[PDB]
Amino acid sequence: DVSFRLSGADPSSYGMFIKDLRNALPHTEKVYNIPLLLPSVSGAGRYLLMHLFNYDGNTITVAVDVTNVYIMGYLALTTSYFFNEPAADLASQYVFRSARRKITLPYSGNYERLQIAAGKPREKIPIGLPALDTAISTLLHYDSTAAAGALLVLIQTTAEAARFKYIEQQIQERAYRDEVPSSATISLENSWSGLSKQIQLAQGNNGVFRTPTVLVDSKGNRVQITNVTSNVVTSNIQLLLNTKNI
Template sequence: MEGNMKVWLVVATWLCWTIIFGLARVINPSAIHNYTADAIPSVSFTITRIPGDDKTDYKQLMVDLRKKLSSGTTSNGVPVLRSTASKEAKYLLVNIINSGKKEITLGLNVINAYVLAYKVGDKSYFFNDPTELKDAQTHLFKDTKQTAIKITGSYDSLKAQGGDRESVDLGIGQLDSHIYTLHKSTALKDVAKSLVCIIQMVSEAARFKSIENKIVDKIDGSFKPKLDIITRENNWGDLSEGIQNADKKGNFKTKVRLQKEDGKEDIISNVNQIIGEMGILLYKKKKIYNIPSFGQTNFGNLIQN
């Protein structure tokens, strides 16, 4: 009996050691704790200045970007952003490499697709937005020298530094050039102009297929945004709300007043009028009461408003 007990003790000990060391080989401790920037999802785009390649790759960037930003739900066939996210899962990186192999990385908020910061080499620059700055600096670009720039991220703030949407061209060539600019200059007037272009070619184009399509159509050229684009950017939150809260016939509860390219009024009152232009929607909970809108224009007047 005593001999059998010894045998069982030996077997039990062997099993314990096998399980412990087996797990140690399977589970790398660094895999448990390594939730650094590497764990933040990312998408990439490389500019070649070959029109056909840039067109294909830019369109793929938009597909990838919407897929990463999407909550997995749709409204009228259009992907919808997340309604919430933990601080650790709140961000998405967009890597853009220009034709001269210069790279920048943007840090986006997955709740609203706002650009919060950008990284150049071992330095990073954050919009001085009081609602986002602390968390963004905690989780984005932690291994870089971080600087908060004197721009809040609103279009008004960018315009005050020389980044006016109506005077800054959009196009792949311009994007290519602005990446060079961000590598060599931190002057606010240079940064503002560059970011106005980059924000619209990334975040706004992801939000609106109509903006993406215009960029693609002008792949070897450029254009200045006119009132049709600007008023859509300003009203993305309201359009998102109208689409998600429309009645069974697609009618909006509140009309959204846009403008056409020539400045004439363009009133959107039904899903079918605008749905083909939309790339991704800001999450808007179905309304029961008349809760005030927190669309981009009103939500701290942040980026892309």
């Protein structure tokens, strides 16, 4: 299990949490020095439990699939909550079994469905450590519309930060003040599967992408990523989705 406490949190302690999160994900192989997530894991070992504490010390436990960093559901007091998707239902067979009741959320976990439920794209949802504190508090008491927005915050400040050093740094900059994610942040989130695939395809292609990946940079300009010498590959991406899962 990994843990993060919003009470007394700073860029340093958040950085430690993201390191812990990355380190809790198993790999037997690195591709271009980037850990390669496993094709599959059987049993309860497939799921990592993140213990998150809001400023007041109230807690949720979040279940994360270690093969893809997808949040499947969470526990809030004695109630478990899972996304409306087969992978999450499967997760409910292994985690939070001692919960008194189980609620299935009226949406899947994908960005498009969550944005519809929340009533706004994540371009317009501020993120940061204060937003994460809010998200935790929101998830403690069931409200499906509010929960959609909270989950959009949660996914980006945990899973996406684990996947990209740039996103981790973005959240560290937002330690005491929320701000909507940069277009670069959104771009990286959307391209994680694509980048993971192409980095793996580069293995037998002299470090060259079979298909170029289009990203928006920090300055806000659209750039093409064609090979492994790109800063996105050498410095940014921290975890690779296995091509068996793409």
